[PDB]
């Protein structure tokens, strides 16, 4: 006998078991992307090369325009959108809401006018242009601040992004652009030091228009690669208040997918699907299409999102609406650059040299590959001097999520198309949509799927005719969700999260349980698997912290010592996992940390010992944590010694600055301090408040006294 | 005229007590302070 | 240096007898799991 | 995961739990059997286990 | 150092993380019972995850945390210490006496004290106690018995009375919010308990935009709760003739629309054209529930057969002695004559299909059922994206 | 802003603020600073009354 | 009421600022720092009831008029 699991699907349905199929155990694919961009740049401009070709005169870099282009002969992708049919759906979407579009550009500026600079330091790395790098957001803006400051650029100090982004478009125009470059000086090592370095003013505009790139390692279930972009911080603020306003805009629309996560979207799905069998004609047939979208960034044009920002704040302060619009400008300008170049070896020698990307052209192109080959002789006409790609047309993933998500939304609501006999309606999220198509037969529900078809392209959305399929209502596909005959299996693809979560003991436990609990809720882990699941972590997690049970013959350095206080002391229930204790978590004490579950069982000198008021493996530092885990999530612990913190991996100005406030004023480090006031003269007041205090109390001496008021008169605030 | 920094200026200075003075003043500085931490302060623009 | 693509090949036969004798009862268990703490709800003792 | 979906299926079926029956049988159901192999181009049933 | 070394006060436990021990006193001293493996019908809810001492908004949930354990930088306490002032003093003996680092009991005072809500699939129950457990209690295929180890019908019977005493005056909002700040349940004003839960009641719905709070955006018609999904109703004034035989001048909806219809325990949605309804779809909640369902989407159809099926009159009051719009009293009409518009509704065959099944006048699961009406044994989740959105005060 | 004006001034003020401007005009939602200002004139005026 | 006003000198805690008789003035930081001079209260405040009793006079002076 030859066994087969496949056959487990002859006896149940594949929905039932579709989380083996998924083979989410292995290691995911991982990686140079140099060549992965140029391939990107290239489809990009491939898809649009029928556009209007012109050249920029602000920057230098040719740009090709699909927006009001031919309209495509032929299924492949097409950029070329109209214009006018975008405002017609953005005109039905005004008219089927009310007044919406005011309310979310409304709520947009005044949460605008509420922002602060610091939100910049959110997210993920940035490309940042004092180097020419990718940097942490934090590091990124700190630099960026940094160097205005040499350029007679102001705003940051005055708080809000406003300014912020007045004075980032007030940059655009200064005759040369001064900053601090790292300079690694040869004395043999390489020390970095600091260099003033100066750029003119197309070098600066190249360099914020500039889109760094990297490849999407981390990605599961798909074989070939794709690559991420990175934006700089002086499109950071523009490209998040569009977003914030599409998200908006969306949250009310009953078609958007986004930004709601979790079981809502769930309850929204089954949703949609009731309602769309609700409304079916008597005897009409109600087609549902799994949509899986491709090229969903290669084909909209940032002019189209221009046009959907202005037509979305039509009756709005002028000032918003030109702060609002920079970002579809600074998109529809951008360029690429292209990873970090191909490399070129002989074997006859054992030689191997990677090539920069500024010097891809200076080679004879007859010695790379016939395939990069062919792309450096089709990127040719966009490549920069210095080593870019000036892509104009379309957009890299991840940048205006919410607003293609609205755009989706606006094609999905049109609904008809010549008062033809059917109607449509659909869930549309970030390059992943499902639509619903009503009708009194098969033959008018296709008549409707190529209707819909059509519109799309017509906005530069070209839904994948691969990917994507057509059946009866009542099974279907969002988003890796199943739905089939009202049954939601969540695919079970939360397995890789039952690993310790690397932050300390008691947290690591709290996380792993409340991860276990949750999955539980949402996810349909029955009993026995979540029993089996709490037992694989309580192993990963003994062997991690090398803290088995003190009875168990394993050898090392702090079982040793925890087999010594296994005997040492009586209370043998009421120790930790991490002390060698017996596990006592099951089913229904997933919710309780485990301290004060085993708070009776201990031993008064265990408790003592264990809960002391005082830790050296407990700073206050180390409390930044305490809320949420890195997505932030909440987890309950207690404190105690095992609440400790793992060793390190204008710095130091701003670093101690806000330690040394933190110390003296102990109630910022939990609430946003207030004041209109000199941080300097705040601390000396503080500080010369507790010195007397201190001395009036008996805890420091007249000489201390004298010390501290000599220094603290020095200052300039005694 | 009361002011948000805690100073004023009256025409006489009978015509309120310590204590409706005092109650104004309060209230200006919590105004202020809630502003501050809202950062409508700054954006905040007074009556000219 | 040229890419180098993966080599085109045919159903083998060991992969088929492996699938087969990894999926059969053996004397030797090896699989051991951590106790966990007792079981005093009904959901619980049907869980374990 | 999947096998104990299965059970609680069978579990919506008949009130009582089944696991003893899925896997070994009762008096009253009989042991639950997949199809697993094949051999001669006959398919061939599996125990749940 | 857990072995050997300096021992601590254990004294500080004992009230410090008062919400753990709570919890593990509720795991405690909860009774379990028997399993019901049969299916579990379960409803996607905006449920409170665990427990609150006394829920506030965030903003006073920290204002309440420095005033406990930051003595210092306390300027001009707002108007939320006195309310809280027995739980600020309340947790500021019980804290005084350790030595813990003051963020650790700052964030555990956040937990106790700010609201921590999520979209959850619930069947039962609804309170915290209910919800810590929620993942041994439920199950897809399975039901466990539990049992865990007031001010609302309060907070209710004072707005109503506030409405009621407001209303009869000119310029009763002012009055309104007079009686509503001046008020208090024994240890606080109104704004203790109607700042607590998420929405409510009409009445409190009503009181919270007079004060201030937020509220959902839900819209409020008699009983029924209703959220727009499309298309635009022109409300537009008509002259129509009663089934009585008189005639009334009133706004009626010119176009279609489509609302997601709540009333107690019941969800459905509801289509409806101009003077006629075309579609609602329910699930089985309870007969009362679904029988207010029916009419109160009935009356705020506006169909004409709901017009046609009048047969007494209208001329009726409130508790203050006023003649309300003609929808209202309508509403009255019906609900007070439940049997009179379901008469001559008309009934259409049962919904021939897998799970849809229809619902006769008398609210039994019997085929038959009324012209448009349809019970889907299905679950219906409605009333997304609760925005709160700005709202004003007349 | 008109959030700050809704959570720290009562719904009266508000309203009296806003039929002030109304009668010159203005709009309370185009110039909410405008309208905090009118409200703080108004709670003070009472407050010294 | 008022700013620093050093004729008091440093600055004094809350268990001092008991001590105070009503009516005096004292010198305090307010959040963090904010040097400011405050004054003990002889009463205790209730801004809504103030707020309420004015829109009373208010509309009783409106309906007078009219």
Redesign the interface.
Known sequence: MNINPYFLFIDVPIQAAISTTFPYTGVPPYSTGTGYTIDTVIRTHEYSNKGKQYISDVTGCTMVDPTNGPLPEDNEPSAYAQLDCVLEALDRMDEEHPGLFQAASQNAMETLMVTTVDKLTQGRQTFDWTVCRNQPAATALNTTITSFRLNDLNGADKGGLIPFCQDIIDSLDRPEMTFFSVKNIKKIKRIPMKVKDKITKVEYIKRALSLNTMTKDAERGKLKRRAIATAGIQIRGFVLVVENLAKNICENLEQSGLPVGGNEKKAKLSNAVAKMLSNCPPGGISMTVTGDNTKWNECLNPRIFLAMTERITRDSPIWFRDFCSIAPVLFSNKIARLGKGFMITSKTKRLKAQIPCPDLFSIPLERYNEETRAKLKKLKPFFNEEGTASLSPGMMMGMFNMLSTVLGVAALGIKNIGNKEYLWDGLQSSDDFALFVNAKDEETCMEGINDFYRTCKLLGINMSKKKSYCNETGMFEFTSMFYRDGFVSNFAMELPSFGVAGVNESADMAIGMTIIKNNMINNGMGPATAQTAIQLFIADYRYTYKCHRGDSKVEGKRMKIIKELWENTKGRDGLLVADGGPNIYNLRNLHIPEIVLKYNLMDPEYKGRLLHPQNPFVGHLSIEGIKEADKKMDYDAVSGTHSWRTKRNEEQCYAKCCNLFEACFNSASYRKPVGQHSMLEAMAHRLRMDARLDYESGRMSKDDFEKAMAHLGEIGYI | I?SY???YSLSNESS?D??????????????????????????????E | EEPKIPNKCRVAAWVQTEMNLLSTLTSKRALDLPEIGPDVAPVEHVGS | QQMEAIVEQESSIQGYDMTKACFKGDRVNSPKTFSIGTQEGKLVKGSFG | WNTYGPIGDTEGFERVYESFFLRKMRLDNATWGRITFGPVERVRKRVLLNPLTKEMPPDEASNVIMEILFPKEAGIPRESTWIHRELIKEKREKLKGTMITPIVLAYMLERELVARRRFLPVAGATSAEFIEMLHCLQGENWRQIYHPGSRSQSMIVACRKIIRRSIVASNPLELAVEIANKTVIDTEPLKSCLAAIDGGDVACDIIRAALGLKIRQRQRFGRLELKRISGRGFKNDEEILIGNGTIQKIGIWDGEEEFHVRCGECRGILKKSKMKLEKLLINSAKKEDMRDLIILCMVFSQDTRMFQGVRGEINFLNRAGQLLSPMYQLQRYFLNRSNDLFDQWGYEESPKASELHGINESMNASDYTLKGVVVTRNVIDDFSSTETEKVSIT | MDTFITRNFQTTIIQKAKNTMAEFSEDPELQPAMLFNICVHLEVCYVIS | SGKYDPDLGDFKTIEELEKLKPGEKANILLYQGKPVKVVKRKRYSALSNDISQGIKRQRMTVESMG
């Open positions: 009361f920094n805690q100073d309120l310590e204590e409706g003075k005092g109650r104004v003043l309060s209230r200006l500085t919590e105004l202020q302070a809630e502003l501050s931490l809202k950062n409508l302060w700054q954006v905040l623009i007074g009556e």
